[PDB]
Amino acid sequence: ANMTEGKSKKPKTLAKECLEKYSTLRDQTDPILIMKSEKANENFLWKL
Amino acid sequence: MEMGRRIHLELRNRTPSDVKELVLDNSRSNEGKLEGLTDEFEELEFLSTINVGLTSIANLPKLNKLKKLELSDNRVSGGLEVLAEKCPNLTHLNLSGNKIKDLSTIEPLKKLENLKSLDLFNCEVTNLNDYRENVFKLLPQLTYLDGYDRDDKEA
Amino acid sequence: MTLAKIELLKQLLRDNEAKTVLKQTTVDQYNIIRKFNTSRIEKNPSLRMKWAMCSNFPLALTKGDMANRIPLEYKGIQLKTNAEDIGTKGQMCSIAAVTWWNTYGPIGDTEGFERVYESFFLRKMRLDNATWGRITFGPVERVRKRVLLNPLTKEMPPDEASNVIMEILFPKEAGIPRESTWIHRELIKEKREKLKGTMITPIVLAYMLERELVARRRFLPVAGATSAEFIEMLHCLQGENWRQIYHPGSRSQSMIVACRKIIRRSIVASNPLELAVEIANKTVIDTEPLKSCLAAIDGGDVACDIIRAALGLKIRQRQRFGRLELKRISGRGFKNDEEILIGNGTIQKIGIWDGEEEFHVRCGECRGILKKSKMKLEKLLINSAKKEDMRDLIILCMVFSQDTRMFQGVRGEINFLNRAGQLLSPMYQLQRYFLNRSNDLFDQWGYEESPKASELHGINESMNASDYTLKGVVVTRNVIDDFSSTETEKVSITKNLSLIKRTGEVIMGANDVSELESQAQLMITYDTPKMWEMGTTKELVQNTYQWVLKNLVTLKAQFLLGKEDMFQWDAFEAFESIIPQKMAGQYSGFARAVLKQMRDQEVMKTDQFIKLLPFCFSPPKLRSNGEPYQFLKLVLKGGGENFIEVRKGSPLFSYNPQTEVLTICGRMMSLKGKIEDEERNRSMGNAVLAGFLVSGKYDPDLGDFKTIEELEKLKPGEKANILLYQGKPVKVVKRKRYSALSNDISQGIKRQRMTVESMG
Amino acid sequence: SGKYDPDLGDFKTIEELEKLKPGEKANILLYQGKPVKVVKRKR
């Protein structure tokens, strides 16, 4: 959640502001893998 | 490590009536109990039991001063009515991470009137329609819940 | 066996030649002695092996009790013989016994192979889980590059690798650990624990560790990825006329950013070199100083090269101009000052290169050959790599060539600076001007007919592979391979961070670094207050907590005394900048009261101590009566998520005691527990013979020598008699502290320059 | 009681205002570009 006055803004700016508010999640670089798919590669998904 | 070791460390080999709180965490228990706490205890305010593998609530000293108790990450599934006969003075209840099947498990809390906050996280009972409303009208004495009665205050 | 050793020694000494050689050659000279072998090497190994395999007993078995497990002849088949040997003094045997041993015999331990041969099993794991794709049979463009053949756990120079190997698998002969074991303490302890419990011969483990650590690099034709993981399979992935899709089963950006930040911090001050090296060797990336990845990769960004020059490391001697990497091929350019009018109408006095010259030029993925004369570019040959890289190469080579057309193509103004606010030389000002406005010299440069030929084809100003190219520029549909003879020639470092050749010529300038900011993908933890007064509040909190954590022993010791000197530390002054002025004093008073209560009426609690200590730098403001104010939620600059919880934890700080772990600014760190016990567990790496200094000679007053285990029994400050390296009896004293020579040198330099300035 | 102070933090939603305690100062926004700083009162 990110309270706003009500103006319309591009999705990129909204996402940037939302991540800025929750900066800790944005700056997370070490992933604590919890579950994995049968075929998908966790490293590739995390880097993406 | 065992409940006895935790009791000795917290009490530091002193009289039982010297500490008003306990921390029984990461302690293996015999068949899922809370042994190591004798009935001689008379004064206690806070409790903490996490990752103790408690499966039922049948062994607990009778008390009249406890106001908070914490149970989490346990497979306990049974009636809690015994708390009324053991300590009907609870104000903070925490069952986060426990295993409760249906609404009937939380029924016996009606006879308790001092409870004001109850916590139930990722519980099988929590995933139901109008569970929030149903619990509220089932426990009128309750003044708080998982945190969003009407506002947000901290214990 | 030690008795057998002494008996063999006595028998050998009975001869006079052994007595005279042993008493003559020092330990160092032993190497020479070993190399005086026959060298009667077999002329043809194939024929020798063929003949030997047909002989009755070619195998040379070492004398021992193993032979008794097997008869000299099994099932009517001869296996081993009891005849004496002269070459090896053992017994003889045949492959029949080897096959029987593979069939029957003692059963060994399988544990050792899980970890001992970790690199090989990791290779197999990367192969097995790899995903294959299509095959492209079309021609593949390949470039010759210096690539690392195999991945490395932690790349280090050969000498450090050997020292680490000895410190791992040779507990004895570990005199005076250098400034390399502390850097690799984690590797030391990890490999030590993993290899413990084995029985393999130590030399095998040493060679395997050398393979796992020492880098192996070679010139190879590559196309596409270049990481060692892809190079392992390059024999299958690549192909002259076929390619395969392969996906095998970070720190770089962080080091780039850290080096750039250090450069910018040091340049603005006077005598940048000392400050830069202080910050560089006082920095750390999550487990290690900056001399753990800088020393790993070869070369790198210009900032990293400059820092390595400031530190002690080898850097490729390529000439960095902006982004261009230049390698001279021939010709000598006389740098003479000249007055030239710029296209803007102004006249600048700058150095111009008289004479013809040629350079191999590289920029990102673009390679080429440039031939230039004085005040003119003559020829440029490139390969099509990338539009951005090609444009950068063209523009930068244009500016470097100092072509009169480039000067006449200026239209704006040249008064720019850097992030530090300094006026640069006109060359770099022009570089920035042209890069900012690429379509300035391109329009007025002039066009040249396309390179009519089989492969040579032109490129237009828009970087598209379009004909009617630029005057001089040419794009050949071939592979240009350059940058041979990476001599890493001797290079000096001036105080201003600018490198120079063995002569006075300048190779790298302090302003080559590009002023581009990024985000450190890792925890860039420094150790100096001067550095971190730039970034955001979260970075300040993280760095302050890391400073507290690193030197936890000193702070914990000072806590027992109970004096205010503990709180007036410079490290917290920066923290004062991120606490509200109107309320910081109340926080300081509250934290001081809480910590006094902690010292008085309870016992050690590291988490809350760390949480509450830093806020006490500012003076307190007690209640009107005198009692301290009480809080439970310390607000920080920026509001919202920038807040600390006094009770349990918050987004910036949360310690869980169930697993005893610490999460600061979204980063988990292992607080094994509390107590000097956890302190010593942290010290569980380090190096054998790290807590003892050398003082005095043999001093036989102690009698015989004592082992490391018995050495630890001695209380601090004692004297012990030990053996250093291969013998060399000495007297040592157990240390009462942990040392850091770099810190001492930096503080000495700081005091020296403080004295110089004060006298000045 | 005052004006926009970025140091105190961003604007506070009604959810935080309702749970606030007396004697604590917060920041609110009237409309775009006209923030203000307010303080809770017992009366």
Side-chain angles (χ1 to χ4, degrees):
Chain A
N2 166 43
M3 182 217 45
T4 186
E5 310 195 35
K7 257 175 58 162
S8 199
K9 37 167 50 42
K10 291 172 190 172
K12 169 150 187 173
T13 314
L14 155 56
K16 179 171 177 190
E17 291 189 340
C18 282
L19 285 168
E20 209 90 350
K21 175 142 190 274
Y22 296 79
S23 212
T24 175
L25 309 177
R26 162 172 64 73
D27 299 4
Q28 184 65 30
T29 324
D30 48 350
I32 315 86
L33 185 73
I34 292 277
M35 179 159 295
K36 182 190 152 162
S37 152
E38 157 279 350
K39 159 163 55 46
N41 191 307
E42 60 269 36
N43 194 337
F44 274 20
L45 292 159
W46 177 253
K47 299 293 179 187
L48 185 46
Chain B
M1 191 285 258
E2 183 178 2
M3 289 300 191
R5 303 313 85 73
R6 270 287 141 205
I7 290 296
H8 303 150
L9 291 166
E10 255 196 290
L11 259 58
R12 308 176 148 290
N13 208 16
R14 294 182 185 173
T15 187
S17 282
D18 70 339
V19 79
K20 267 66 73 177
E21 77 205 339
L22 263 180
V23 179
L24 305 174
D25 285 335
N26 301 355
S27 325
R28 290 90 171 83
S29 200
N30 171 282
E31 311 296 280
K33 277 146 177 73
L34 56 148
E35 183 178 2
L37 173 67
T38 60
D39 288 271
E40 314 205 15
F41 263 70
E42 305 294 318
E43 49 184 13
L44 177 63
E45 176 65 359
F46 273 19
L47 258 176
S48 174
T49 87
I50 287 151
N51 285 54
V52 298
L54 187 61
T55 75
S56 84
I57 293 285
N59 186 1
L60 184 74
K62 319 305 151 284
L63 201 42
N64 39 3
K65 297 171 167 181
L66 193 82
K67 270 106 186 180
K68 144 169 183 190
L69 177 63
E70 212 188 14
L71 330 172
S72 149
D73 199 18
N74 287 338
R75 75 163 211 259
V76 60
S77 275
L80 326 179
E81 45 293 330
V82 300
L83 311 163
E85 310 286 17
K86 287 153 168 299
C87 178
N89 203 279
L90 320 171
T91 48
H92 298 26
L93 200 31
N94 164 82
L95 295 174
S96 69
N98 284 243
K99 271 186 235 195
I100 50 165
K101 201 194 284 148
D102 304 88
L103 174 46
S104 163
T105 69
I106 211 73
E107 286 276 22
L109 255 287
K110 51 167 191 334
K111 63 174 57 47
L112 281 93
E113 51 285 20
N114 216 40
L115 191 32
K116 79 103 175 185
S117 171
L118 173 62
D119 289 345
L120 284 161
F121 294 0
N122 289 337
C123 271
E124 160 166 354
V125 173
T126 41
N127 54 227
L128 298 170
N129 204 163
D130 281 4
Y131 141 82
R132 174 64 62 76
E133 215 282 340
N134 289 358
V135 161
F136 276 10
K137 69 173 176 55
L138 197 70
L139 310 171
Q141 70 279 16
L142 268 180
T143 300
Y144 261 59
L145 210 65
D146 297 347
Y148 176 77
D149 230 17
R150 290 182 187 173
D151 289 345
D152 246 350
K153 265 199 197 172
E154 293 193 24
Chain C
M1 194 23 64
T2 185
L3 177 63
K5 278 279 185 22
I6 294 169
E7 293 282 40
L8 289 168
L9 189 31
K10 184 179 177 180
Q11 289 145 38
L12 185 87
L13 295 174
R14 283 216 265 276
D15 164 38
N16 62 334
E17 299 174 353
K19 219 154 251 175
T20 59
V21 298
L22 281 154
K23 296 182 174 200
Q24 185 115 346
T25 68
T26 78
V27 193
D28 278 298
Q29 313 293 36
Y30 153 88
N31 273 106
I32 302 110
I33 305 323
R34 192 209 178 167
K35 297 208 79 45
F36 293 172
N37 281 328
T38 47
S39 287
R40 263 187 163 194
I41 282 168
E42 179 55 6
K43 292 184 178 185
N44 188 330
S46 322
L47 290 158
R48 166 39 51 101
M49 181 35 88
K50 286 149 192 196
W51 300 335
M53 287 333 292
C54 299
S55 80
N56 228 308
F57 307 98
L59 220 74
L61 212 81
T62 67
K63 66 195 93 86
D65 87 312
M66 319 310 302
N68 75 346
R69 267 78 161 178
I70 280 151
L72 309 107
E73 142 162 31
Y74 197 66
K75 304 234 182 177
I77 298 159
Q78 249 166 15
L79 305 179
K80 34 193 72 173
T81 47
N82 56 333
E84 99 298 15
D85 302 346
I86 291 166
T88 192
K89 313 170 279 160
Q91 305 165 19
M92 282 315 208
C93 195
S94 160
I95 34 172
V98 185
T99 314
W100 192 89
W101 193 293
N102 311 118
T103 325
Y104 319 92
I107 305 180
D109 314 328
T110 63
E111 270 134 22
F113 258 53
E114 307 189 346
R115 55 245 178 204
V116 167
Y117 291 107
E118 149 172 344
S119 174
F120 298 135
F121 281 80
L122 272 177
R123 261 208 274 266
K124 190 172 181 323
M125 185 316 302
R126 287 196 297 261
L127 170 60
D128 282 351
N129 298 284
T131 84
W132 316 89
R134 315 178 297 92
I135 286 166
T136 317
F137 286 105
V140 179
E141 101 180 304
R142 298 185 284 176
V143 281
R144 306 306 219 293
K145 298 175 131 198
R146 266 185 45 93
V147 292
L148 164 70
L149 296 324
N150 302 340
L152 310 173
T153 46
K154 205 273 188 181
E155 182 157 5
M156 338 186 307
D159 183 47
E160 287 199 315
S162 59
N163 162 62
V164 167
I165 289 156
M166 301 215 58
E167 268 288 352
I168 291 162
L169 43 57
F170 291 135
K172 300 150 278 287
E173 310 117 308
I176 305 103
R178 310 204 300 141
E179 171 284 349
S180 192
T181 68
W182 267 114
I183 301 178
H184 320 125
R185 53 170 309 277
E186 78 194 60
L187 173 63
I188 291 286
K189 79 205 194 189
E190 182 49 289
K191 290 302 185 53
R192 190 180 270 136
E193 209 288 306
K194 282 204 308 215
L195 260 52
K196 281 344 184 178
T198 188
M199 283 275 254
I200 307 182
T201 184
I203 304 104
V204 161
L205 301 173
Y207 272 127
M208 191 36 48
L209 290 168
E210 174 146 27
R211 277 153 209 189
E212 187 171 351
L213 306 164
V214 168
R216 281 167 174 169
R217 301 160 156 286
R218 261 205 275 266
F219 254 88
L220 276 180
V222 193
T226 318
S227 75
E229 284 71 318
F230 289 68
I231 300 299
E232 291 295 10
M233 291 285 308
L234 195 90
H235 48 92
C236 305
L237 306 206
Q238 291 284 262
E240 181 51 286
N241 284 347
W242 61 277
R243 167 84 153 288
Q244 207 215 1
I245 299 328
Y246 175 89
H247 300 145
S250 81
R251 286 149 52 82
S252 196
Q253 184 184 336
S254 69
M255 38 195 262
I256 298 328
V257 169
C259 289
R260 292 206 189 193
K261 209 183 294 304
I262 294 164
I263 284 270
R264 267 204 298 280
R265 157 61 65 162
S266 35
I267 173 50
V268 85
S270 158
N271 185 274
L273 162 73
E274 291 158 1
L275 202 173
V277 64
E278 294 148 22
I279 301 192
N281 63 355
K282 284 182 81 70
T283 326
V284 154
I285 315 293
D286 316 318
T287 180
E288 57 212 347
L290 264 171
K291 285 207 297 301
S292 266
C293 208
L294 278 276
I297 185 61
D298 228 15
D301 161 278
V302 307
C304 309
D305 275 341
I306 294 169
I307 289 299
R308 281 200 208 87
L311 268 169
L313 262 171
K314 110 188 310 194
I315 48 157
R316 302 179 279 206
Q317 198 214 27
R318 42 152 169 67
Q319 271 207 16
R320 297 305 306 273
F321 167 86
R323 301 190 54 193
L324 283 174
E325 314 147 14
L326 303 166
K327 167 177 183 312
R328 284 171 144 158
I329 285 164
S330 61
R332 270 214 204 174
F334 323 94
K335 181 154 195 235
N336 264 312
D337 188 12
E338 182 163 315
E339 187 165 350
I340 313 101
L341 88 170
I342 299 166
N344 275 323
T346 73
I347 278 174
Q348 268 296 351
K349 176 183 221 144
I350 59 182
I352 310 299
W353 306 87
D354 306 26
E356 169 269 350
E357 215 161 17
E358 306 178 29
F359 324 83
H360 288 319
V361 297
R362 174 153 218 157
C363 163
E365 326 153 49
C366 267
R367 296 147 281 100
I369 298 160
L370 164 61
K371 165 171 81 206
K372 57 154 277 166
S373 158
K374 69 152 284 295
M375 282 269 125
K376 190 198 67 45
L377 183 145
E378 207 141 14
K379 192 77 176 173
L380 179 60
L381 245 190
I382 320 172
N383 299 133
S384 266
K386 179 165 161 224
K387 293 184 72 165
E388 208 188 322
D389 280 18
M390 225 176 305
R391 148 201 93 180
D392 280 82
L393 173 68
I394 292 299
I395 298 155
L396 285 173
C397 289
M398 272 295 198
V399 178
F400 165 54
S401 45
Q402 296 162 24
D403 194 304
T404 44
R405 200 55 32 200
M406 171 275 298
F407 288 131
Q408 305 231 359
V410 189
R411 293 227 301 106
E413 186 177 1
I414 41 180
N415 278 323
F416 331 123
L417 316 169
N418 58 13
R419 263 173 180 164
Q422 314 160 249
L423 185 59
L424 295 151
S425 56
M427 225 53 255
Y428 289 94
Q429 294 201 104
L430 276 148
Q431 162 189 150
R432 214 213 91 171
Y433 167 85
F434 286 121
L435 288 164
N436 183 358
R437 305 164 75 178
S438 84
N439 57 268
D440 279 3
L441 79 175
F442 273 48
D443 300 354
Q444 69 108 41
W445 167 246
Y447 267 7
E448 152 56 50
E449 294 174 351
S450 326
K452 316 287 295 197
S454 49
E455 53 188 4
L456 271 71
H457 101 273
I459 179 170
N460 64 0
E461 93 186 349
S462 78
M463 298 299 112
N464 314 330
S466 282
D467 309 299
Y468 288 90
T469 187
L470 286 284
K471 184 180 178 180
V473 172
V474 176
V475 163
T476 189
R477 205 160 303 108
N478 264 24
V479 202
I480 300 332
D481 302 320
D482 294 342
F483 298 81
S484 308
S485 153
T486 70
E487 313 203 337
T488 64
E489 188 55 32
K490 335 206 315 208
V491 167
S492 163
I493 315 96
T494 190
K495 57 187 274 213
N496 303 85
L497 312 159
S498 291
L499 310 201
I500 63 185
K501 303 208 230 311
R502 279 191 53 137
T503 81
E505 191 75 52
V506 309
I507 279 195
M508 284 179 198
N511 38 57
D512 306 316
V513 290
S514 66
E515 326 305 352
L516 261 284
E517 181 66 299
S518 323
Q519 311 325 319
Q521 267 286 61
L522 298 167
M523 320 307 115
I524 184 67
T525 82
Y526 314 82
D527 298 330
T528 185
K530 302 181 125 162
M531 201 45 238
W532 39 50
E533 62 218 84
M534 333 163 96
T536 87
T537 53
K538 301 270 287 309
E539 158 262 351
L540 222 61
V541 175
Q542 170 170 21
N543 76 29
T544 39
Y545 275 116
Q546 271 308 97
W547 175 100
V548 165
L549 243 180
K550 182 176 179 179
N551 49 40
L552 204 76
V553 174
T554 72
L555 272 192
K556 187 171 184 176
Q558 301 344 292
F559 177 54
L560 200 62
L561 301 163
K563 207 211 163 297
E564 60 174 307
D565 278 344
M566 141 165 79
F567 272 139
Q568 202 264 350
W569 292 155
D570 191 4
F572 304 120
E573 191 145 329
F575 207 161
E576 202 210 65
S577 40
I578 57 162
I579 307 169
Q581 209 159 15
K582 308 181 134 194
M583 166 172 295
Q586 270 170 19
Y587 290 170
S588 49
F590 175 43
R592 193 147 172 70
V594 169
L595 290 165
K596 291 304 204 225
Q597 192 279 342
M598 146 59 91
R599 195 174 68 242
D600 293 313
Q601 300 176 24
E602 76 202 4
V603 301
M604 161 275 308
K605 200 166 177 73
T606 53
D607 161 34
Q608 91 179 21
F609 165 42
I610 299 151
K611 174 162 31 193
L612 302 164
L613 195 178
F615 279 97
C616 324
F617 194 61
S618 324
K621 330 198 286 291
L622 305 165
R623 181 187 211 161
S624 196
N625 76 341
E627 291 297 336
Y629 286 82
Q630 199 159 1
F631 282 136
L632 290 158
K633 156 154 162 27
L634 304 181
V635 57
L636 213 71
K637 298 272 267 157
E641 191 171 0
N642 307 28
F643 94 115
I644 315 312
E645 290 285 70
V646 176
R647 292 181 174 173
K648 269 216 166 287
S650 97
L652 305 86
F653 197 166
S654 92
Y655 167 83
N656 83 73
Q658 49 258 52
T659 48
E660 292 164 341
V661 198
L662 192 101
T663 302
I664 214 84
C665 299
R667 155 60 193 276
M668 150 164 167
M669 321 205 198
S670 285
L671 264 181
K672 140 173 174 299
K674 325 214 159 181
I675 310 158
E676 57 80 21
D677 218 41
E678 91 83 27
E679 292 312 312
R680 295 188 180 170
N681 192 237
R682 281 190 155 163
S683 272
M684 180 46 198
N686 202 5
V688 47
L689 209 161
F692 313 82
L693 282 168
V694 72
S695 295
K697 304 195 188 188
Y698 177 27
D699 184 279
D701 278 335
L702 285 165
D704 203 44
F705 321 94
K706 48 173 44 53
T707 325
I708 302 111
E709 140 176 285
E710 298 187 29
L711 250 170
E712 273 90 63
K713 309 289 263 286
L714 309 179
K715 65 202 61 73
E718 284 194 50
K719 92 181 205 67
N721 163 223
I722 204 55
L723 290 162
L724 203 78
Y725 299 116
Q726 286 73 356
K728 185 174 286 188
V730 299
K731 194 199 96 166
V732 287
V733 305
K734 199 164 177 175
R735 290 162 70 162
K736 308 166 183 175
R737 295 177 187 162
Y738 289 106
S739 312
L741 304 172
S742 45
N743 268 320
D744 310 352
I745 297 173
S746 38
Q747 291 326 290
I749 298 333
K750 161 56 201 167
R751 294 180 202 166
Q752 281 255 46
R753 59 203 209 201
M754 184 47 255
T755 316
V756 165
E757 263 185 22
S758 36
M759 189 185 133
Chain D
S1 97
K3 296 184 172 186
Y4 193 10
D5 179 9
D7 308 345
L8 259 176
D10 219 46
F11 320 117
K12 293 179 179 179
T13 59
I14 295 180
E15 296 174 351
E16 153 157 348
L17 297 174
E18 271 200 2
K19 63 99 185 163
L20 189 60
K21 183 178 179 180
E24 183 178 2
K25 342 294 182 181
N27 239 358
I28 73 185
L29 187 147
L30 308 176
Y31 47 77
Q32 46 159 17
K34 198 158 293 208
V36 70
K37 173 204 192 347
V38 309
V39 47
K40 186 175 282 292
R41 302 296 179 85
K42 293 177 181 178
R43 290 180 185 173

